[PDB]
Amino acid sequence: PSIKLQSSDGEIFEVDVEIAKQSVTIKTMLEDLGMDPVPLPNVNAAILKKVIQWCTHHKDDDIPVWDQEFLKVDQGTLFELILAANYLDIKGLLDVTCKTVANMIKGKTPEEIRKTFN
Amino acid sequence: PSIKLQSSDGEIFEVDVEIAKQSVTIKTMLEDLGMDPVPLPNVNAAILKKVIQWCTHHKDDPVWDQEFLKVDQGTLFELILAANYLDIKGLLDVTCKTVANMIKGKTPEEIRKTFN
Amino acid sequence: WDSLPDELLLGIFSCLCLPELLKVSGVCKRWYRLASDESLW
Amino acid sequence: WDSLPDELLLGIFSCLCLPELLKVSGVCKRWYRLASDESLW
After folding, report:
1. A 44-103 near D (Cβ less than 8 A)
2. Which positions carry Phosphothreonine (chain A)?
3. With b meaning 16 or more CB within 10 Å and e meaning fewer, what string describes D12-28?
4. CB-count exposure of residue C30 (10 Å: 0-12, 13-18, 19+)
5. How many other β-carbons are positioned within 10 Å of the β-carbon of residue B26?
6. Class in CATH terms, D1-41
7. Residue-range domains of chain B with CATH
8. Using the beta-carbon criterion (under 8 Å), do C12 and B112 form an inter-chain contact?
9. Could you point out which of B34, B66, C36, D22 has its C-alpha 20 to 30 Å from the C-alpha of D3?
10. Which residues face A16 on adjacent strands?
C-alpha cells in the first residue's frame, strides 16, 4: 500500500506505508485518519526526500556504516534532519543524527566546539 | 532492503530492492554486476521518480493507473520509453493503452494536433 | 511523438481495433508506414 | 544551533559519556544550563 506525502513546498512523494510508518505520526494518519495527500507543512522537499531515503533503507529494522555515509552532509542539512526527525517523530533517525552531532563534540575543547558549530 | 538507483541526471533514489521484481533491467544490473549505485543513463530523475512511484503502488500485484497517467503527453511518451528501457512490462502496457485511447474515437486531424 | 522507436509505436497501434488503423494511417507518413505493418493484421 | 529546541540538545548531550558534559558546559550560556539537566544526572 502506498500513500502520498506532500512537502511544505508541494512536492509529492509516493511512499510505501511500510516505509512511511517509521514516522509514528504519519503512521497514525495513514492507518487511522486515512489521509489522502498527507500534508507535512514543516518539512521541505529536499529534507523530506532524505528522510524518505533513510526510512526506505531502515524499513526492515555504534553508528552503522551506512548511516555514517548517509549523514556525511553539511552541518545545516544535519540540523534540518534532526528537526525533521523530531517533527515527524522518527526515533531512529533522531538518534543517529543526534549521535552524529555528539561525535563532533567528543574529544574536543569548548573552544574547538565553538569553532566548528559557530 | 534498499539499493541506490542513479538517474541520468545524477540524482540518487534510495529504492526498495523489491523494485527488481518489476524492472528486469535493474534486476540484471543488481544481480549480474553489482553496481552499488545502479546507473540508469536512459532515464531522468523526473521520469524515474514517477516510474518508482508506479512500481511502489504496484508492488503488491485500472482506475489508479488512469489517474496516475492523467498527465502531460510528453511525460506519457517518456514513461513509455522508460518502461521499455527498464523493462517493466505492466507499466509499458498501460501507458501504450492510455495513448491508444487518445487515438481511438478521433480523426487524423485531432491526433496530429494532440500529439503535435 | 517520433522519439519512440517503431517498435513502441506498433505497441501503441496494436492496442487499437483494426478499422481504427485507418485513422492512424492518415496522421503521419511514419504512422502510415507503420499502420500497414505485417504484424498488425 | 540557532534553532534546535533544548529538548533536542539534551538528546545530543545524552549521547556523551558524563565526563564529556564538562566540555559541553564550557561552550556557552545555553549549553551550561542544559548540561546541568536533571535528566542527565
Report:
1. 79, 82-83, 86, 94-95, 98-99, 101-103
2. 109
3. bbebbeeebbebbbebe
4. middle
5. 24
6. mainly alpha
7. 1-116 (3.30.710.10)
8. no
9. D22
10. A2
Among A82, A104, A79, residue whose Cα is nearest residue A93 = A82
* Mutation to test the C interface, candidates B103, B104, B109, most C Cβ within 10 Å: B103
What resolution in angstroms, rounded to 1 decimal?
Answer: 1.8
CA distance A105 to chain B (A): 30
CA neighbor of A99 nearest in space, from B74, B30, B10, D14: D14
- Is residue B87 less than 8 Å (CB to CB) from chain A? no
Query: Looking at this protein, which amino acid is placed at residue D35?
Result: A
Which of C8, C15, C23 lies nearest to residue B97, judging by beta carbons? C15
Experimental method: X-ray
Tell me the pairing of strands B38-39 and B2-6. parallel
Decide if D24 touches A, using CB distance below 8 A: yes
C-alpha span between B98 and A111 (Å, rounded): 64
